């Protein structure tokens, strides 16, 4: 559900074709206004914890805005999530799994990693069962669980005079609502 969630917010780079018509509002807004050079939502996983969030690269006058759109998208997904965009989120992930396991090296990685982490290799049918399981309510219940009213770990490097204050970032991690 968190992979589906990160797929809805998606990822953008200035070399992308779609630009203003992109599905994920953060990319659309970032493309139209030209807020950032790139952003990427990640879910880094470890044994009993991880890092769920996002990364962006932008002009020094665009940090507050990018942050505002990004957190706006998190809060939105926590509170309100359309069935259509979640289906897009699923399909992006469906395509991601099958795209990634093509060639032998990614499959050999998947095996070697799976047995150390998951314990067993997980079939694509099992993954599909868990993707098909996810609907709009699940995304909201899960996004809101991990992101709503939670202190986030923030890392800023470069011309970051605009980077919002932690209290203001922390205020953005819940809504008005």
């Amino acid at each position: 559900a968190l992979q589906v969630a990160n797929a809805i917010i998606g990822h953008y780079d200035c070399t992308y074709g779609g630009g203003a018509h992109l599905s994920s509002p953060l990319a659309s807004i970032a493309a139209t206004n030209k807020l950032c050079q790139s952003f990427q939502t990640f879910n880094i996983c470890y044994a009993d914890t991880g890092l769920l969030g996002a990364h962006f690269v932008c002009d020094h006058m665009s940090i507050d805005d990018m942050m505002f759109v990004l957190q706006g998208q998190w809060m939105r997904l926590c509170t309100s999530a359309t069935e259509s965009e979640v289906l897009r989120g699923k399909n992006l992930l469906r395509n991601a799994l099958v795209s990634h396991l093509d060639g032998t090296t990614p499959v050999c990685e998947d095996i070697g990693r799976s047995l150390l982490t998951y314990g067993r290799r997980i079939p694509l049918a099992e993954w599909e069962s868990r993707i098909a399981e996810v609907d709009a309510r699940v995304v909201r219940e899960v996004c809101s669980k991990y992101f709503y009213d939670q202190c986030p770990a923030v890392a800023g490097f470069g011309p970051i005079e605009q980077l919002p204050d932690y209290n203001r970032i922390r205020s953005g991690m819940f809504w008005l609502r």
Binding site: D13, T15, Y16, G17, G18, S38
Partner: peptide, 30 residues
């Protein structure tokens, strides 16, 4: 880039091939 280890592989592996897309970032393969 800086030392010899990382600097390996940069030399032209094949004639460059420009890829642009709707979703994927634009790349220059080989």
């Amino acid at each position: 880039v800086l030392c010899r280890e990382s600097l390996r592989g940069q030399a032209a592996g094949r004639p460059l091939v420009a890829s642009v897309s709707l979703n994927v970032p634009a790349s220059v393969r080989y």
